[PDB]
Design an enzyme around this catalytic site. Structure first.
Site, PDB file in Angstrom:
ATOM      1  N   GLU A   1      -3.253   0.566  -8.925  1.00 18.63           N
ATOM      2  CA  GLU A   1      -3.218  -0.181  -7.675  1.00 18.63           C
ATOM      3  C   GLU A   1      -3.449   0.761  -6.500  1.00 18.63           C
ATOM      4  O   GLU A   1      -2.755   1.774  -6.366  1.00 18.63           O
ATOM      5  CB  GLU A   1      -1.884  -0.913  -7.521  1.00 18.63           C
ATOM      6  CG  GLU A   1      -1.712  -1.638  -6.199  1.00 18.63           C
ATOM      7  CD  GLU A   1      -0.396  -2.380  -6.116  1.00 18.63           C
ATOM      8  OE1 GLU A   1       0.055  -2.909  -7.154  1.00 18.63           O
ATOM      9  OE2 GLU A   1       0.188  -2.438  -5.015  1.00 18.63           O
TER      10      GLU A   1
ATOM     11  N   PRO B   1      -7.750   2.507   2.568  1.00 21.81           N
ATOM     12  CA  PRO B   1      -7.502   3.646   3.461  1.00 21.81           C
ATOM     13  C   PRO B   1      -7.689   3.273   4.923  1.00 21.81           C
ATOM     14  O   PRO B   1      -8.524   2.438   5.276  1.00 21.81           O
ATOM     15  CB  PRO B   1      -8.531   4.691   3.010  1.00 21.81           C
ATOM     16  CG  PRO B   1      -9.076   4.202   1.718  1.00 21.81           C
ATOM     17  CD  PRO B   1      -8.932   2.724   1.724  1.00 21.81           C
ATOM     18  N   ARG B   2      -6.890   3.912   5.779  1.00 19.00           N
ATOM     19  CA  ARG B   2      -6.941   3.651   7.213  1.00 19.00           C
ATOM     20  C   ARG B   2      -8.244   4.100   7.866  1.00 19.00           C
ATOM     21  O   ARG B   2      -8.524   3.682   8.994  1.00 19.00           O
ATOM     22  CB  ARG B   2      -5.767   4.343   7.904  1.00 19.00           C
ATOM     23  CG  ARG B   2      -4.406   3.748   7.565  1.00 19.00           C
ATOM     24  CD  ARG B   2      -3.682   3.209   8.794  1.00 19.00           C
ATOM     25  NE  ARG B   2      -4.574   2.498   9.704  1.00 19.00           N
ATOM     26  CZ  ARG B   2      -4.409   2.419  11.018  1.00 19.00           C
ATOM     27  NH1 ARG B   2      -3.366   2.968  11.619  1.00 19.00           N
ATOM     28  NH2 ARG B   2      -5.309   1.766  11.746  1.00 19.00           N
TER      29      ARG B   2
ATOM     30  N   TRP C   1      -3.775  -6.123  -0.402  1.00 20.64           N
ATOM     31  CA  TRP C   1      -4.218  -6.966   0.706  1.00 20.64           C
ATOM     32  C   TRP C   1      -3.124  -6.910   1.766  1.00 20.64           C
ATOM     33  O   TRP C   1      -2.086  -7.564   1.632  1.00 20.64           O
ATOM     34  CB  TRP C   1      -4.469  -8.391   0.220  1.00 20.64           C
ATOM     35  CG  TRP C   1      -4.565  -9.439   1.290  1.00 20.64           C
ATOM     36  CD1 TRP C   1      -3.531 -10.054   1.930  1.00 20.64           C
ATOM     37  CD2 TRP C   1      -5.760 -10.062   1.774  1.00 20.64           C
ATOM     38  NE1 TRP C   1      -4.008 -10.983   2.820  1.00 20.64           N
ATOM     39  CE2 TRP C   1      -5.375 -11.014   2.737  1.00 20.64           C
ATOM     40  CE3 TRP C   1      -7.119  -9.902   1.494  1.00 20.64           C
ATOM     41  CZ2 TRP C   1      -6.297 -11.796   3.427  1.00 20.64           C
ATOM     42  CZ3 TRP C   1      -8.035 -10.675   2.182  1.00 20.64           C
ATOM     43  CH2 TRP C   1      -7.621 -11.610   3.137  1.00 20.64           C
TER      44      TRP C   1
ATOM     45  N   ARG D   1       2.391 -14.579  -1.449  1.00 20.26           N
ATOM     46  CA  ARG D   1       2.821 -15.324  -0.276  1.00 20.26           C
ATOM     47  C   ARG D   1       2.832 -14.483   0.991  1.00 20.26           C
ATOM     48  O   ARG D   1       2.683 -15.036   2.084  1.00 20.26           O
ATOM     49  CB  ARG D   1       4.223 -15.901  -0.503  1.00 20.26           C
ATOM     50  CG  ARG D   1       4.764 -16.719   0.659  1.00 20.26           C
ATOM     51  CD  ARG D   1       6.121 -17.319   0.325  1.00 20.26           C
ATOM     52  NE  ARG D   1       7.148 -16.303   0.129  1.00 20.26           N
ATOM     53  CZ  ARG D   1       7.830 -15.725   1.108  1.00 20.26           C
ATOM     54  NH1 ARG D   1       7.608 -16.023   2.378  1.00 20.26           N
ATOM     55  NH2 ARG D   1       8.758 -14.821   0.806  1.00 20.26           N
TER      56      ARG D   1
ATOM     57  N   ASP E   1      14.891 -18.770  -8.856  1.00 15.04           N
ATOM     58  CA  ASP E   1      13.681 -17.973  -8.697  1.00 15.04           C
ATOM     59  C   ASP E   1      12.841 -17.998  -9.965  1.00 15.04           C
ATOM     60  O   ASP E   1      11.612 -18.110  -9.901  1.00 15.04           O
ATOM     61  CB  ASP E   1      14.048 -16.535  -8.326  1.00 15.04           C
ATOM     62  CG  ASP E   1      12.888 -15.776  -7.716  1.00 15.04           C
ATOM     63  OD1 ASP E   1      12.127 -16.381  -6.932  1.00 15.04           O
ATOM     64  OD2 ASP E   1      12.735 -14.575  -8.021  1.00 15.04           O
TER      65      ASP E   1
ATOM     66  N   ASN F   1       7.876  12.363  19.826  1.00 17.64           N
ATOM     67  CA  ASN F   1       7.768  13.313  18.729  1.00 17.64           C
ATOM     68  C   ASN F   1       7.696  14.709  19.329  1.00 17.64           C
ATOM     69  O   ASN F   1       7.324  14.878  20.494  1.00 17.64           O
ATOM     70  CB  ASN F   1       6.542  13.030  17.858  1.00 17.64           C
ATOM     71  CG  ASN F   1       6.820  13.211  16.383  1.00 17.64           C
ATOM     72  OD1 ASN F   1       7.116  14.314  15.928  1.00 17.64           O
ATOM     73  ND2 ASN F   1       6.727  12.125  15.627  1.00 17.64           N
TER      74      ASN F   1
END
Ligand SMILES: Cc1cc2nc3c(=O)[nH]c(=O)nc-3n(C[C@H](O)[C@H](O)[C@H](O)COP(=O)(O)OP(=O)(O)OC[C@H]3O[C@@H](n4cnc5c(N)ncnc54)[C@H](O)[C@@H]3O)c2cc1C
Ligand SMILES: Cc1cc2nc3c(=O)[nH]c(=O)nc-3n(C[C@H](O)[C@H](O)[C@H](O)COP(=O)(O)OP(=O)(O)OC[C@H]3O[C@@H](n4cnc5c(N)ncnc54)[C@H](O)[C@@H]3O)c2cc1C
Ligand SMILES: C[S@@+](CC[C@H](N)C(=O)[O-])C[C@H]1O[C@@H](n2cnc3c(N)ncnc32)[C@H](O)[C@@H]1O
Ligand SMILES: C[S@@+](CC[C@H](N)C(=O)[O-])C[C@H]1O[C@@H](n2cnc3c(N)ncnc32)[C@H](O)[C@@H]1O
Ligand SMILES: C[S@@+](CC[C@H](N)C(=O)[O-])C[C@H]1O[C@@H](n2cnc3c(N)ncnc32)[C@H](O)[C@@H]1O
Ligand SMILES: C[S@@+](CC[C@H](N)C(=O)[O-])C[C@H]1O[C@@H](n2cnc3c(N)ncnc32)[C@H](O)[C@@H]1O
Lengths: 553, 553
Positions: A20, A24-25, A52, A114, A157, A392
């Site tokens: 999985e 990537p950003r 996702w 969901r 559940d 920071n």
């Protein structure tokens, strides 16, 4: 079909594994991810899946979109790819268009979830896909070995899980667990209900302290005492953490596969291969830049694993942080920007607010203030009190044993170095005064300034990452845990500025003066990042800030 | 065909460029080279060519062989590839088999050279290829704008060039030149003889000090005073050297293309793109790991540009080094290994030999002893005098301005660091005593030992390169000029050991006792490489060597 091969593997007694990954950003992150796909495919994974993430417009057309990551993996790499799907706050026609595109793009497998906040439960989406697109898409669904956090009980559940799998679906992917016994319990329980679809256990390799620290927060997972105890001394030395995680994974996976009730192991890679590859090689299922230490949003942007773990769906906002407590911490209402300055100061000093409540958190930094800022606390209080809102910082450090309890890390017997730097918001007036003053520190001080409008001023190289932390270790290359990089910094601004009106602004009404103050700050205040390159000398950042104030005042 | 497209480009007035690469010394070097090919192809080079180096069994089947580099470039990359060929000391059937394989492998273009020591001149090879393989292969030949070093004159050399091109060939590639005027002179001279084949000017971008230093030795090239003068202050800062070289290349290429007599520019890449790419972009012909600083055999092995420049055909043994002077330097005859120890000692001390001749060189290190060994000279004399024959070394250094005249390098205003290390041969007895002694320095001292037989003993990681020199510079990543790497070191032994019997042994007859001594040394002496990791402390290598001697003696 995917289900077909999985059953023609189960009936033969073959054991398989799956990987999985998350989008990537950054673009070069996508390229490196594709390289990882190619290299890992030599192991012969049954299928990969691409997370996702609703936050980063997943159904878009950029090179970061999960949709296109999956599409590239399936077309160019040929690897079986399952695209995850979410429902929360999504309209019918958006889902419809997404699935249409997927059909056009060749995403033959849709994983229906969901998400978190015309669809409410995952059953509604599986039913939409089965109604409209027929049986083209193979559907798997999430299962929870201990029970979904917000479910009423484990039995209701399980009933709802039965309902979901009965509507559609083809197999259940099970959230990470630390002991095989619980997974066996879950499998048996499902069996009683007669869930015929195979259940695939999720394997999470602990890879570095960051993963553990995030994971421990998740209550229901109930991280065994042993893991925390063993890691804690090792905590600084991530490599050792990774080794221990590999050992744990191998043990757990061996115990699972011993039983034969497991068709295949589902490994959360976090876009880092070596750990998973080593685990697979230990089990023997492996068919036959090296950036594996992301260091949150600071490490190498080009790494596919770049990104704060809190953005991962597993640790996305689980730290509820009730809004009433945020309101009582940062002041019910603000009279002027001085109030904002006060909040920033208390976060570092620790004294209780006038109302008696200690300011424990800020929108940006959720983690507790590390023990390195004790070397800067007085100066940080100084700068913050004078309208320089630090989010920071770190002190400049010369050679220091890697075993130092405060600043040490990495393989023992090394030497660790740091460059002082300061991330802080400022008023437009203070920003301009800071720009003027820096002219005399141009050689030794690197600075980035950017506004929410996108205007950016920087003297650093356009795309060269400025190294800020490094260590010297025996028989090893130079490690660079922490980097200041314009590319990572430039888009980080959007998150940092959004937090002003998202986490702080929403606490106040739309017409309230506090909202106006927060909007003013969000609109005008610059985001600044200073680095002092002369690390073997006294930290001049204090001095430059002081002369900035002297010029301004 | 290649000639066809070149003429259908000349007749249209199109200008083109070509790139020359050399087989990387290492497999991952080959992979990175292929990546470079793919990336550079976006510029649209007319053809690439792969150098044919006789030394490294060029007509072999390993992944380093020039043959296979060319084959991969033409098949996988699709780039037009010319394979260079040499004649010196090659038999008929070897050439025949090579060309047969090339035909099978699809190397549609063969570049015919003579090399250096049934074929004597390049005319013989062009004629063999034309006789046997017909007109399948496109043949170009080297030309020299100023005259081949060993030719009797420039006019007889031109006559011989005419002779060569008349037998076969299709165009002439011209050795690097520093001024377009000389190339124009050459073109005109050839025109008078009526050389109809196009002549392609060789462009050499100066990239770093190493290239300049090697090139200046070549007399006939006559490096203009300006280049040496300007570089000399810059010498340490390679990046600036590269910038200046880019400026020079752009100027020269503009002056050439202004005339229109040049069909296309032939760039010697040295497996480094950025420089050539920048030059092409400046001219505007570009269609549209970052290791670009090889640092000889010390830098990153995986870099395609890895390798001492002296191995490049252009600077292969041009430093004649007459054998009679080598014999008089290192002693006409040797009575025992003490003579070898004496030679090694004098090489560093500089006092004249008993016969009055100073030992100026050794088989391994040709370059003059750098000014950093002044900080180690006494200890080096000690170790050498006691049978530890050092062939390389460096002192451990803490932070030091990059402007330091002795040890500084790189962008100004940085800090430069070094780890002490020691490359040296030893007697097997000394080697074992050193192995025993090191047990107490295991943590801080990394060591590699290897024999000519191939037996290797090392405590460093199997394949992790130990970083030994690095620098801290503003707004930039950590640069690592010098590396100790088992992969580079392990095959380097073959060169180092071969030099014993090749450069020193040959000076003595086959039955002479000196030859027996040299053979004994070549057979039994280990090659050793020690590194001290505790760079902020006093150099312990002296101490460990001293205790090695104390244990042995
Ligand atoms: C393998 C795996 C991958 C994941 N990937 C992602 C991802 O890419 N992105 C992301 O945002 N999240 C992801 N998640 C997390 C998941 O989306 C969240 O846990 C989500 O809140 C629950 O979705 P669900 O599929 O369980 O849907 P549901 O089962 O519909 O929702 C879970 C809750 O709803 C209840 N429920 C279900 N049906 C009914 C019913 N009929 N009546 C009443 N209550 C009902 C259950 O009891 C449970 O409490 C993943 C989880 C797993 C295990
Ligand atoms: C573009 C280029 C690429 C090169 N690539 C390589 C390579 O990959 N590997 C390598 O080892 N070297 C290479 N070289 C160097 C070259 O191989 C050497 O310079 C070699 O010694 C000369 O070869 P040649 O082609 O000039 O052959 P030749 O021209 O036959 O030899 C040169 C000398 O022979 C003389 N000569 C030629 N014909 C006659 C004749 N009929 N009678 C008398 N004298 C004659 C010439 O006057 C000259 O002095 C390259 C050179 C250039 C310019
Ligand atoms: C990722 S670290 C930066 C240090 C760097 N990672 C290193 O290797 O030492 C985050 C640091 O920012 C510091 N700092 C964090 N938040 C701050 C704040 N609001 N104000 C001032 N300093 C802060 C904390 O000490 C915290 O350890
Ligand atoms: C954030 S820094 C140090 C932070 C701060 N100075 C401290 O020690 O509290 C530690 C980082 O170094 C990186 N690290 C990189 N390589 C490592 C290695 N071989 N061993 C241990 N840590 C490593 C990890 O990203 C890890 O998160
Ligand atoms: C490539 S350098 C190594 C230093 C390293 N490149 C650096 O960045 O400083 C080669 C060095 O080996 C040293 N040294 C070279 N030959 C030696 C020899 N025979 N004996 C002892 N020392 C030697 C010289 O000072 C020479 O500068
Ligand atoms: C061999 S070392 C230093 C040798 C020795 N210490 C001295 O200065 O005399 C210099 C090397 O640093 C590398 N170097 C790498 N990057 C550089 C950069 N941006 N600027 C200057 N030099 C660089 C080059 O390979 C260059 O050959």
């Amino acid at each position: 079909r995917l289900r077909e091969k999985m059953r023609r593997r189960l009936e033969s007694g073959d054991k398989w594994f799956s990987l999985e990954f998350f989008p990537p950003r950054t673009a070069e992150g996508a390229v490196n991810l594709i390289s990882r796909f190619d290299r890992m495919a030599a192991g012969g994974p049954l299928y990969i899946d691409v997370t996702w993430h609703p936050a980063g417009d997943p159904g878009s057309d950029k090179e970061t979109s999960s949709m296109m990551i999956a599409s590239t993996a399936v077309n160019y790499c040929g690897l079986e790819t399952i695209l995850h799907m979410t429902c929360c706050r999504q309209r019918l026609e958006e889902i419809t268009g997404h699935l249409h595109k997927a059909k056009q793009l060749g995403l033959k497998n849709i994983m229906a979830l969901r998400g978190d906040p015309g669809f409410n439960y995952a059953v509604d989406l599986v039913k939409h896909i089965r109604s409209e697109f027929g049986d083209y898409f193979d559907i798997c669904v999430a299962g929870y070995p201990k029970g979904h956090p917000e479910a009423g009980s484990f039995e209701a559940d399980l009933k709802h899980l039965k309902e979901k799998v009965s509507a559609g679906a083809d197999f259940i992917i099970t959230q990470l667990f630390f002991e095989a016994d619980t997974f066996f319990r879950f499998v048996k329980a499902c069996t009683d209900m007669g869930i015929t679809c195979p259940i695939v256990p999720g394997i999470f390799p602990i890879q570095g302290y960051h993963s553990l620290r995030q994971l421990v927060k998740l209550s229901k997972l109930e991280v065994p005492q042993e893991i925390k105890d063993v890691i804690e001394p090792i905590k600084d030395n991530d490599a050792a953490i990774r080794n221990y995680g590999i050992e744990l994974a191998v043990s757990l996976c061996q115990e699972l596969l011993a039983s034969g009730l497991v068709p295949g192991l589902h490994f959360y890679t976090l876009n880092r291969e070596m750990a998973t590859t080593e685990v697979l090689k230990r089990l023997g299922m492996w068919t036959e830049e090296w950036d594996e230490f992301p260091n949150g949003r600071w490490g190498n942007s080009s790494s596919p694993a770049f990104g704060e773990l809190k953005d991962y769906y597993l640790f996305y906002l689980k730290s509820k942080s009730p809004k009433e407590e945020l309101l009582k911490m940062w002041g019910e209402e603000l009279t002027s920007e001085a109030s904002v300055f006060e909040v920033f100061v208390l976060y570092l000093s620790g004294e209780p607010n006038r109302n008696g409540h200690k300011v424990t958190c800020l929108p940006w930094n959720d983690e507790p203030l590390a023990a390195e800022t004790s070397l800067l606390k007085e100066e940080l209080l100084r700068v913050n009190r004078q309208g320089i809102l630090t989010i920071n910082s770190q002190p400049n450090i010369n050679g220091k044993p890697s075993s130092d309890p405060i600043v040490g890390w990495g393989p023992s017997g090394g030497y660790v170095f740091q460059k002082a730097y300061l991330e802080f918001f400022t008023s437009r007036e203070t920003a301009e005064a800071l720009l003027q003053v820096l002219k005399k520190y141009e050689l030794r001080v690197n600075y980035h300034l950017v506004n929410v409008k996108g205007e950016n001023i920087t003297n650093a190289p356009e795309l060269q990452p400025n190294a800020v932390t490094w260590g010297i270790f025996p028989g090893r290359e130079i490690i660079q845990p922490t980097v200041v990089d314009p590319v990572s910094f430039m888009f980080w601004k959007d998150e940092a500025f959004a937090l002003w009106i998202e986490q702080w602004g929403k606490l106040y009404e739309e017409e309230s003066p506090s909202r106006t103050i927060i909007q003013y700050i969000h609109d005008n205040y610059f985001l600044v990042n200073l680095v002092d390159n002369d690390f073997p000398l006294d930290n001049c950042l204090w001095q430059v800030v002081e002369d900035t104030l002297e010029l301004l005042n």
